Structure formats: C-alpha cells, structure tokens
Design a protein around this ligand. Structure first.
Ligand SMILES: *[C@@H]1O[C@H](CO)[C@@H](O[C@@H]2O[C@H](CO)[C@@H](O)[C@H](O)[C@H]2NC(C)=O)[C@H](O)[C@H]1NC(C)=O
Ligand SMILES: *[C@@H]1O[C@H](CO)[C@@H](O[C@@H]2O[C@H](CO)[C@@H](O)[C@H](O)[C@H]2NC(C)=O)[C@H](O)[C@H]1NC(C)=O
Ligand SMILES: c1coc(CNc2ncnc3nc[nH]c23)c1
Ligand SMILES: c1coc(CNc2ncnc3nc[nH]c23)c1
Lengths: 540, 540
C-alpha cells in the first residue's frame, strides 16, 4: 500500500488506537492528525488575542511596582537630587496615562506570563478532553470571556471594581461550581433558567462588544475615539494628533479648572488628521486579508492576517512599528530578537485571592462567567456533536458528561494558571469537518500548543492593530444568532435588543445580561400574572 | 339605517367622495377617518421627538446671541462694573458646557420654531400625498434622518462640520434631486446601485444609532456615560454627581494641564451614585409603558409613554422636573402655563444657506440624505402598497409615481420650514390595517396635525428622559431587518456588520454607509475581477 497506510493500520489496531476507538469511528491516525492541524490553524489566533487582552487587564501587579519619577522628565530618577528637585512617589494614577515605566515593564512581563498561561491552559484542556471525554474538541481561553475578564471584571490596568487576583479566584470558583452542577446533571436546569431571547442574543451582544473593543485604540485599530458632544466619533488619526481628557469643574461664567485626583484617560481624542493613522490602515489591510481568507474558506484566516500585520510592524523605524525608539520599545525588540524562549510563569501562576468573596461585584462577575460558560459550552458541545454525528435520537452523544467535566476542570486549571475561563472552541468544528472523530484530534492540538511555546518572543510582539481585525471579525461571526430571534414579537425583541446593545454601550457582558433578563421579566409579568390567576381559577 | 351610515352614503356618492375613489376602494368616510386617527395615534410621538432632536442641533443662531457674562457668577452682567470686574466676551465655547444663557434661550425659541415646523411639514406632506397621490400615507420628518441631521451633519449646538442653514440647503437640494430622479424614473437604478447587504443593514444600523442616542444624557435617559478607560460605561447617576471632561497634556513625569481652547463636554462622566438617577428610572418606567402598549397592540404606545413621563416631569419641585428652579426653568414653566399658543416660525423658516456647496461635508450629508430617503421611501411605499393590496402583478400600484413626487415635494417644503427630510411613515400601515384606502386618511392625519398646533407649550416641555424610551424602542423596531441578511456568507455578513456597527460607534449614518459600501466593494473585488477575466475569455 504505502507508508501512510501502514502507519494508519498499525496504529488503528494497536492498544493505543483501540483506546481511542479509532476503528469504530472510521478514522485511525492521519485523519486525526489532519483534523487536529486544521483545528489548530483555525484557533491559533487565540495565542495572540487572549494574551494581549488579558495583559490589558494589568496583571497581578499594582502601584507597588511603579518606580518613583523625577520632577523633570529629562533627568533619570537616580539623578533626582539637586536644588528644587524631588522624586514624585507613585500613586494609583501611575497605572494610567502617562503610564509609569515600571508598571509598563511589569505589564510586559505579565504579557509573557499570560502567553505561556494561555498556551498551557489550552494544552491541558485539550489533553483532558481527548483522554477523559475522547472527543475531537479543542479547549482554550474563550473569546467571549477574555474581554469581560480583562476590561470589565478587572478593568484596564486594574481600573475595575475587582482585582485581577480576585477575578482569578472568581473564575476558579466558577469552574468548581460548573463542575459540580455538571456532575449532578443540574446544568440543564440552569440553562433553561435563562430566557430564550436573552440566551440567543447574548452571543450577538458579546460579538458587538468584541467588535467595539477591536475598534478602540489600546485594544484594536482605532477608528472610534472620544467626542465631547457624542462620546464616540471617527478616530484613526496619528498617535501624535491625539490628546487625553481630564475631569474639570464648570461654573456660571466659563471658568474650567482641573479636578485633583481625576482619572486621566489615554490618548483617545483626535484633534486633527482623522483617517490618517498608518496603524489603522495596516489594521484595515489585515482585516481585508482575514476577510478574504474567511470568504475563500482558508483555514487560519485570522492567524494569517495577524501574522501579516505583526510582521509589517516588526520593522524598527516605521510609523506602524511594534518597537518604537524608546526604552520600552528597545526592551521589547531585545526580547523579540530571541526567536525561541522558554518562559516560566512567575506572576500569574497560582495568583488566586479570595479577599473579595463578600463583595457583590465578585459574585456579579462569578455568575456572569458561570452562565456565559454554561450557555456557550452547552451550545458549542451539542453543535459539535451534531457535526460529528454523535448525537442519537435522545440527544445524548455518549461522552457529553465527561466533556462537560473536562471543560470545568480546564476552567479551574486555567484560573490556577492566571487566565480567563477556557471553553471548547467552535473552531473544533473544522477538525470535525476534516474527519476528526476521536480524542487524538485534541492531543494533536495540544502538541501544536506545545510548539506554540518556545515562541513567546514572537507572540509577545503583536500590536493592537494586529489584534484588531481578528476581534472585529470574531464579532462578525457571532452575529449570525440574531436570525434566531423573533423580531416581530416585542416580548422577545425588546429583551434581545437590550441584551445586544447594553453589552457594547455599557461595555459589560454582565450588565447586558442583567438588563436583558430584567426587561424579559418585566415584559412577561402581565402574562405570568394572568396565567397564575387562571391556574388559580379566577379567570377563564 | 343610522346617522353614521347616512353620512357615509352621502359622502361616498358625492363629487368629493368620487374624487378620492371611495366607492371603488370599499371605504367611504368613517373608515378613512378611523384609519387616519389610528395612523396619527401611531405617529404622534414624532411631534415631540423630531422637535427635541432638531433643537439639540442648536438651530440657526450662533455665538452672536451669546450674552456677555460677568467675571463672577453672583453678579448679573448689567452690574458688571467695579474694581477688577470685567465682562467676558462670548466665544465658540459659549455654545457648550457651561452653555451661555442667551444661547440656551435661543435654543428654546428654536425648539418652539421646530415644533411648529415639524407640524407644518407633516401637515403639508400629508395633504400633498392625499390629494396628488390619493394614498392613505402620512408624511413627517423621518426618524432615521432626524438624528443624522441634528447630531452628525450639524452636530450638537452646531459642533458639526456643516452649519444648520447649510444643512437645510443640503436637504432642500436633496429633495430637489430626489424629485428629479423620480420624475424621470431613474430612482430604481440608484436603489440598485446600493449593495443589498448594506441596503438591508442600514435600517438596523440606524436603529442602533437611535437607541444609542436614547441612552445618552442630553438625548435620552442616560445609562451610558463617559469612561476614561473604555469610553462608555454605566451612567444614570444623579445629575449632581456628573462632571465634564477637558483635554489635557500629559508628560513623562505625571503633570497634566488644561489645553487652552479645549472643547469641554457636557456632564457625561459619573463619579458616584450609578443607577440612582431618578430621571433615568422615570425613563425606564416610560420604556416599560411603551413596551407593554406595543406588546398589547395598543395604538399610540410611544405617545402614551411620552405623555406619562412628561406629565410626571411637569411637577415643579421634584428631581425629575422639566422646569428646574432656575431662570431658564422659570421661563419654560411660564411658557408651559399657557396650554394653547399659536407660535409663528421666526428663525428656522426660510433659513436656507448655499455657502457650503463647495465643501465636501455638504455633499457627504446631501448624498447620505438622498440615499437614506431613496431606500427608505421605496421600501416603505411598496410595503404599504402591499398592505393595502394596491400592488399588481407587475409591481405597480397606480399612484407610485405621484407618491414619490409628493414625498420629494414634502422634503423640499420641510427644508424650507427648517426641518430634516420628511418621509412616508411606516406607521401608515396602521391606517391601512384599519381600512384606510384613499387619500382622505392622509387629510385626516393632516387635520390632526393642525390640532397638534396650538399645543406647542405642551410639546415644548418634553424632557430628554421622555424622548428617551421612544428612541430606544424605535431602534428596537428597526432591528427586524437583520433576519434578511445571510450571516453565513461572509461577503454579505461583513459589509452588513460594518454598516450596523459603524453607525452607533462612529455615531454617523454617512460613515456607516461609506464603511459598509467600501467593505462590500473590497470583498467582491476578487469575484468581480475573476468574472471580468472570464467574460473576456482568459479563464474558463
Ligand atoms: C513634570 O515636568 C514638567 C515639565 O515637562 C513640569 O512642568 C511645570 O509646569 C508648567 C509647565 O511647564 C510650568 O509652569 C512649570 O515651570 C513647569 N516646571 C518645569 C520644571 O518644567 C512639572 O511641574 C513636573 N511635575 C512635577 C510634579 O514636578
Ligand atoms: C468665574 O467664576 C468663579 C466663581 O465661581 C470665579 O472664582 C474663581 O474660582 C476658581 C476655582 O474655584 C479659583 O481658582 C479662582 O481663584 C477664583 N477667582 C475669583 C476671582 O473668584 C472665577 O474667577 C471666574 N472666572 C473669571 C475668568 O472671571
Ligand atoms: C459566547 C460566544 O463565545 C463565548 C466564549 N468563547 C468561545 N466559545 C466557544 N468557542 C469559541 N471559539 C473562540 N472563542 C470561543 C461566549
Ligand atoms: C431608515 C428607517 O427609517 C428611516 C427614515 N425614517 C422613517 N422612515 C419611514 N417610516 C418612519 N416612521 C418613523 N420614522 C420613519 C430610514
């Protein structure tokens, strides 16, 4: 026959091959390898996106690592001794514009830690799913929860109500709760507890939220900046033509003065040169590349676009460079020079903190994580089971129990490594479409994630305009659920619309879910009350 | 028989009755009156919403009417004579926070003018449609174009690139162009020139834009405020707990100083007390009222909710009052005391200005108006023709030619009166569902609009939290078009997603359309090039 056929027949009839039920599922070794490769190509964008988004959270370090800064910018702090010269002690404002150099350095170290954490969590989840559940599903930090954890639960550079360690503890406890409810078969009841329009429209709302993030400045390609009158207008002006905003006090004559302690923003307001940012146009080029790759059914569309934009940004002395001519840029380029590096997690590994359990925001974030994971994992797992033809008449696909337990265990392990919840990727369908049927597909994806390590220097040098279009197009892909909402029935359209729109506007998944569920409950109060009276016999 | 039957038979067989073809359409006089009443009840919210939105544009008056203000707030300017005391001459900043009292007074006068202008334009459009076209369609300033004209073309208090008079000239010329192309049957070609996904998703994008406006502060109920890190978060804190933002200059040590000439914003940032604004909760109550009225198929849902919120706000010494204890509030309450007033347009009538024709923003706004009107009017007119069963096998419903000419003439007249383009309302379907078939329905709506005059004092005292939920629910109603987009085909999903999302985020209908069309063209360049090569014979 051939070497490939000999390998396939040897593996299929071996003890390892029969452990994965290769022969019973009509695929032995090379179909599984090809399916795993296709799935990894489809999901590889996460290696960059998850790390960047979680690094934007600020990590585990606080003002404690902000180096004191001299009164005058031109003198390095060690030389901050002289007449009328003093060292300014850092405060909370050191974490934001202008970011303290020490905090930025710690954020870069956290980005390396989170790259390794994403790779390790995805690897472990894939291995657990392949061995325990024996399904061709790949696990990794979900895109829906990455942004919620980074920009809402924790906030940009720790500006949220919950600290990064407390958010990790919330994710850990959420994974434990999910594992518990799945183990006792009580998950389906929680799934039903969520209103149908809200459940369906949460995906579209999260897609809009991710797209909005991809159109911010510190997150994506720009194109959406601050506006005094409208709060959002056309950004994409060059970084030099952007200024920060500070709170002020108005009066009845026209005087305006700064407010002490005000939280100054990033360079989000454009003063001139709109639609002239070279980084924005490079991001648009990457968007076009990914869009054509998706249209042409090319596996790895997002990774190809990210690679193009990042490689164009790897040049040192351009306006779209990822390594500006500064100390931080010099350090980033020095780390990037080493193509391969075995980075060890030093900050985000085992950074759980249960101080904020009593806080209400902790439980808001915990419940949002729990329900996003429940709904997403249920829908994705059953859709992949349908794709692979494992769903029987009753709706059970054999390894569903262990699939959900594996997902929950992966969430807990990811929390222990310092990353947002890890879920089963819909990109796994690609591997299913290529013939993957057993757990060897997940093991292949895990091996590719192993290979993803030793490349943190390349993965840590991906700019915002590279993250960018991947986020916008992920938001595009998640909008297809709007067709499942009955927009003629207002009792279902209003909750769905609220769920979709509050998520980007309030910029929070939890607020979108709360508003949608509240509107659904309010709009059905009349129907529920009438039905209760009827069931009691008052009405006919 | 009965008095009603005698009236119906008398009118149906009279010359006036046969002029409207009553007998040939199976409805004589009371069916038309009932249909007109139902249509007016459905569309009455415009009387408030259009006037408020266009008043937010700032009107025809500039810094020229800003009264000079004394150095100290406690001394009225006439007494601004003394040691170290001077009168500050107004500048452009007088138009924004803190708004100069003179400019605010002129804006209130403009609001009265625009209430009368909306009523008059709707009346004239309805009369023209009823007489010339003989259809049961009601015309009024369209909701899609109100916000674009007020907040994008002209900007809040004239902060946009085009002045209010120049925008009126743009609307006038756009109406003339629409009339010209309709007269020569060339409108359908322009309609086809717009890509299908962009055409379908523009409605949903405008709905999202209107909903976002309804969640702003100076426009709706709040619930969306400024955030330094995310640019949007949860508002609805009390007005006392909101502060303005000003541009500043950052450095490498941490000093931040004000930027001279910076455009200070309104009180958009919440410092504390989130979700505690009584006005926001009153707006939420109005939202619930309108939502139940829509669910229960109650005609006039939005007008009922607006009336409830406005009446609750008409009390003088509450936290949700429309007449705060100030000079402006006192004047507003004094005008409101007179229930009936015959206001005469003094500023916005005949305020056309053709200075900005050469500007590119003038033509951007003109083309956006033209295409929004073309697509909206085509879709709405043909949908109403289908509702009334006037569409034959070929797709012609007799009076379509004169219907489009009437719409264009109404647009021109509305521009002459100082209001955004006037279109045929989808609410006309209500009158069609009640039996209205002839032009007498439009005349009845016009008579109800006559009655709408003599009530400017009541219509001019409608707060933002009353406009509010009407805008959010209008945005809800316009989302049903998303089901007409194929979200599995990326060549159609990406342009549709861009069109939907750029409109609220860039906060502009023109930018949304431009981005959607550009993405559609880019994504189809490969297909078009391949097809061109094939048609030339290079490929097979
Ligand atoms: C941080 O450095 C800036 C200089 O870049 C200091 O600016 C001071 O404030 C204004 C701006 O020039 C002037 O009135 C002062 O003369 C500036 N002084 C100096 C030495 O530049 C700013 O004061 C510094 N911040 C602190 C806390 O010392
Ligand atoms: C505008 O009015 C205020 C009163 O509300 C004047 O008071 C100033 O207030 C600021 C901030 O509280 C102080 O820093 C100034 O020293 C105050 N000056 C005076 C003279 O009271 C303010 O001066 C007025 N501005 C102008 C330009 O006249
Ligand atoms: C809603 C939509 O997506 C999520 C969590 N993230 C996620 N789930 C499933 N498959 C994914 N593939 C990438 N990101 C994914 C919640
Ligand atoms: C897209 C959706 O609505 C418009 C213009 N406004 C408008 N058109 C048709 N019927 C309406 N009814 C209220 N506002 C309407 C454009």
């Amino acid at each position: 026959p051939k070497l490939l056929n000999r390998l396939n027949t040897y593996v299929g009839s071996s003890r390892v091959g029969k452990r994965f039920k290769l022969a019973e599922r009509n695929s032995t070794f090379t179909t599984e390898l090809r399916a795993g490769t296709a799935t990894f190509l489809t999901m590889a964008y996460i290696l960059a996106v998850n790390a960047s988004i979680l690094s934007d959270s600020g990590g585990t370090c606080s003002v404690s690592d902000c180096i004191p800064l001299c009164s005058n910018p031109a003198i390095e702090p060690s030389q901050c001794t002289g007449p009328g010269l003093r060292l300014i002690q850092p405060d909370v404002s050191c974490k934001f514009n202008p970011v303290n150099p020490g905090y930025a350095a710690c954020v870069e170290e956290i980005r390396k830690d989170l790259i390794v954490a994403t790779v390790a969590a995805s690897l472990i989840g894939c291995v657990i799913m392949g061995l325990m559940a024996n399904l061709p599903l790949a696990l990794a930090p979900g895109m829906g929860t990455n942004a919620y954890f980074a920009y809402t639960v924790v906030g940009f550079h720790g500006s949220g109500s919950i600290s990064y360690r407390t958010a990790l503890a919330a994710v850990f406890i959420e994974g434990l709760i999910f594992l518990f409810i799945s183990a006792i078969g009580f998950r389906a009841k929680l799934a039903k507890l969520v209103p149908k329009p809200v459940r369906i429209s949460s995906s579209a709302g999260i897609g809009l939220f991710l797209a909005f993030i991809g159109l911010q400045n510190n997150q994506g390609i720009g194109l959406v900046g601050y506006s005094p009158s409208t709060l959002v207008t056309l950004a994409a002006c060059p970084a030099s033509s952007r200024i920060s905003l500070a709170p002020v006090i108005t009066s009845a004559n026209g005087t305006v003065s700064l407010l002490a302690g005000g939280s100054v923003s990033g360079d989000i307001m454009c003063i001139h040169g709109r639609m002239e940012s070279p980084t924005f146009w490079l991001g648009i080029v990457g968007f076009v590349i990914i869009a054509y790759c998706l249209v042409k059914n090319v596996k790895g569309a997002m990774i190809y676009g990210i690679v193009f934009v990042t490689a164009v940004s790897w040049f040192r002395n351009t306006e779209v460079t990822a390594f500006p001519n500064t100390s931080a840029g010099d350090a980033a380029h020095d780390y990037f020079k080493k193509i391969v590096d075995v980075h060890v997690i030093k900050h985000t590994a085992g950074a759980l903190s249960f101080s904020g359990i009593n806080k209400g925001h902790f439980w808001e974030a915990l419940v949002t994580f729990l329900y996003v994971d429940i709904l997403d994992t249920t829908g994705t797992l059953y859709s992949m089971a349908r794709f692979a033809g494992f769903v029987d008449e009753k709706g059970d696909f054999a390894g569903q129990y262990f699939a959900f337990m594996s997902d929950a265990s992966a969430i807990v392990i990811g929390s222990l490594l310092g990353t947002s919840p890890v879920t089963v990727f819909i990109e796994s369908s690609t591997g299913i479409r290529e013939g993957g049927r057993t757990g060897l597909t997940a093991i292949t994806v895990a091996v590719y994630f192993l290979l993803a390590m030793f490349f943190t220097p390349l993965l840590a040098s991906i700019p915002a305009w590279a993250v960018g279009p991947p986020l916008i197009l992920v938001g595009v892909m998640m909008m297809k659920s709007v067709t499942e909402i009955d927009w003629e029935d207002m009792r279902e359209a209003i909750p769905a619309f609220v769920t979709m729109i509050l998520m980007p506007l309030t910029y929070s998944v939890a607020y979108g879910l709360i508003g949608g569920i509240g509107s659904y409950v309010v709009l059905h109060l009349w129907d529920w009350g009438e039905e209760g009276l009827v069931k009691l016999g008052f009405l006919k």
